[model samples]
Target: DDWEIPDGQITVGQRIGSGSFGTVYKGKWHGDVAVKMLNVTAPTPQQLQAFKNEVGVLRKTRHVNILLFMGYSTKPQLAIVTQWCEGSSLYHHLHIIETKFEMIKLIDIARQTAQGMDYLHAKSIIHRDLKSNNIFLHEDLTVKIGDFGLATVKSRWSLSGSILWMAPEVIRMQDKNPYSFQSDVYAFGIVLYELMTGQLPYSNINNRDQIIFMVGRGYLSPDLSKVRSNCPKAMKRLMAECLKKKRDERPLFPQILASIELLARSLPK
Candidate 1:
């Protein structure tokens, strides 16, 4: 897959976001695009490998629920370009902007996210980190899963992912048990919880060490009582299934999607 754009074609503008790995800028390539440039002045082997992995995954993936990969460049700057999501991230929509969404809208967002994850799993690609922040929205309010920097083709993975949404198995870091699609399922559950409640999984816990200790002891998920009464019971049940302590017990992406679809149908017109 050759998706390399000329360095001159990309004009990086204001910085939209940044993390430990890179800084994402609102840029252009014939149209609006997001350019994520790796932070390292001298890229390490691992950093380069992750960069290539993300580009490779993005280039292969084509789904309405997934972000569209436009192109990439390594000469002027090791940057990966994708369609710019004008509606901002799910986190901003829920927390910063405090955009109050109806139940149907929330369900639609969750369904679209599940569709994206299902597509990725079908392609044998696992998005190691699946969180509200990584979910982008279009002007039309279509949710698209983004940030494949930590994604991989293999089932087993090293201990790496956001703490709040991490699965117990991944957090445990056992040699025999490595992270797989099941881990993503757990994180997906957390995302759904966030969508339903507009809050983080463990927002009550202030201390990181305490949160880690509690989560390590299988107290990772939020209390169901925190969820709004308006949330559909079916959706709540599906979320519980996803957050099962036993990874094998968690519903697959297809099952999750099916559950969501059924819940959608149950909603009043």
Candidate 2:
């Protein structure tokens, strides 16, 4: 009841982007917000359950590095209100505007991401989908991990995600070994490459089956040439551990946070 914001109090503005189940709009409630409106009158049981689960997780999670969930609304339609990241998605910055990331800034972003992921893991929530598109940046370019449990909801609708960011164990869910917290780390490893190179993973590969062959069967990582020459060796080393195909071998987010934080310290003042 407390987290619900009445439709009359919110002023909807520009359409921000498509959300997990609806179109997101820039709006105002308590402050600047991203409004995700699912234009359904009365929600189906399936949809309702997913929405509640997502809200449950968001309500429990409160961290600076994680997107802030302000509230929800069911007046005009089912809607979710969250903090508006003015800089938009990291994917947009990297690919759309074509801004290059500095080596130090990349490590900073990676460390922030690790902090958020560590918080999520500490809350006992598995952020199954972690990628550039799902990570938002404020106008200041500070990071916030967005789109948190929606992938779980989206999984019910169909096979989800960009696939290139997927962990090998996830692709094989063709997994008695289903997705666990380690799955998030694997995707975080892919995100590390995205930040270091400002390039999509497997940029040369076009065929879906080929990717499945290379990733699922062969377990190949993205090309190394894309990495910056000055990239910290320690990060690349940790990346190797993160990318380990065996899920159990992947370092947990706490370990990852500590490693990245220490690596950031090693950077020049």
Candidate 3:
């Protein structure tokens, strides 16, 4: 597959986001675009490795709910090009700007995210890192499944992702239990909780070790009282099913999409 774009086709512009894995940049492609550039100055093994793997997995995906991978290049620098999500990320909305998350609008986001995950799971695409930060938001608040750095094909996986949203099995295992499709759902639940509460998961817990220990051992889950009355019961029901300790007990995205869309119709004209 000819996925390569010319080296200078994209004029890298202002920086958008950056971390140990890679740095994202605002670029001028056909128009304004987002670029995940493999680190230029002293690139780490993690950056190059994950950049290529993310491009590999992302190139195969073509869903409206999933971030659209335009192309990539590896000349003077390595970078992956994608459509610009002007609104940034769900994390930006909930934490940075502190936007008021209305219940009805969030239902729209939930349903679309469910569809995206349904498509991924059907294709055996396990999103190992499913969090607000990894999910981007369009200007319209239309969410896209973002970040494939830790994404893996169902045949394999690894030890990554944040501890707060991590499934108990993956967190507690001494390299025994591997991450599965259900693990993504568990993280989705944490995101749902984040959206509902507009608060960081384990916000009160200042100690990382305590959080890992408590959550990994199944001694803790996000406080349910954080869920408000205006929140849809259906969506809450779905989130509850998502956070189940037993991996098999969680509702798959197909079932989740159906239940959410079904409730969607009840909204009057």
Candidate 4:
């Protein structure tokens, strides 16, 4: 039951961002919204399927920690409308603010993100791309997990998602090594690492292939020394547990959320 928005109703404004599948515009639909217009010009069946999947995911999820899906248009142009977040993305905010981000603020961001992921996992949605870039922020510094183009309803197949945030099992890309909710858990670890360090995993590495190779072999993860310097003992333990090479060893989102909640509560204001 998808709500169809009229193309004319959505007034596209400045180009906010672009990805492999489409371009995101800062738009208006009586009020401010972010419109993700699909690159439907001669789109492959797979691309169309992914677009539909995104719509399905958005329609199914309704939580404060998750982005709000307004409506969509498939007539003149295929677009998905969501609430416009004034604070932009976690990736942009981290890089722009950098060292100014206090440890408590970083922990809050991680906790909120874990809450969002926990919600998705509970609803049986696996967000394949669970990176900092996909996590949007609001003016009040609230975190909302978005970008569900690659999400699936609990599947065991495919080689998709960003290389940097992928789990070792996913990077292996063997038919036997199918990704699951644990894969998202691993990505969450990377996101937590990014929040603490203000850098992508393996940021020092320039070559993509090199990173893929190293990560696939389970050699590349966030620097533990750096994580220890920035995070508390509990936070560090959670990150390590999330990044465990064995999928079974990785904690579920709810468990991760519980650990994060504990850490957040222990921290002083």
Q: lDDT per prediction?
A: 0.80, 0.80, 0.78, 0.80
Each model's backbone clash number: 0, 0, 0, 0
Flag clash pairs in model 1.
none
Q: Which segments of candidate 3 are over 4 A away from where they belong? A: 40-54, 149-161, 267-269
Tens digit per residue, CA lDDT, model 2, 102-166: 77888888988999989998998888678998888777458898877455556565334568777
Model 1's alpha-carbon lDDT is 0.80
For residues 50-87, what per-residue lDDT tens digits would candidate 1 score against the true structure?
66676776778899998887888776767778888887
Which ten-residue region of model 1 has the weakest summed lDDT? 151-160
- TM-scores for all candidates: the values are 0.91, 0.92, 0.88, 0.89
Compose the digit string of candidate 4's lDDT tens values, residues 25-133: 9998879999887655545456566666768767888999998888877766777888898876887777766645788888999999999999988998878788888
Quality of model 4 by C-alpha lDDT:
0.80
Q: Candidate 3: how many backbone clashes?
A: 0
For candidate 3, lDDT tens digit of each residue in 1-269?
67778877888899867674568899989999888765655345665665567677776788989888898877657777888877768888888999887777777777778788888778768887788888877986687998764333223422344777898888887584467889888988888888778887778888788888888888987887777776767777778889998889998888888888888887645
Q: Is candidate 1 or candidate 3 better by TM-score?
A: 1
Candidate 2 regions exceeding 4 Å error are 45-50, 155-161
What is the model-wide C-alpha lDDT for candidate 3?
0.78
Off by over 4 Å in 1: 42-50, 150-161
Ranking of all candidate structures by their TM-score, best first: 2, 1, 4, 3
At residue 118, give the lDDT of candidate 2.
93
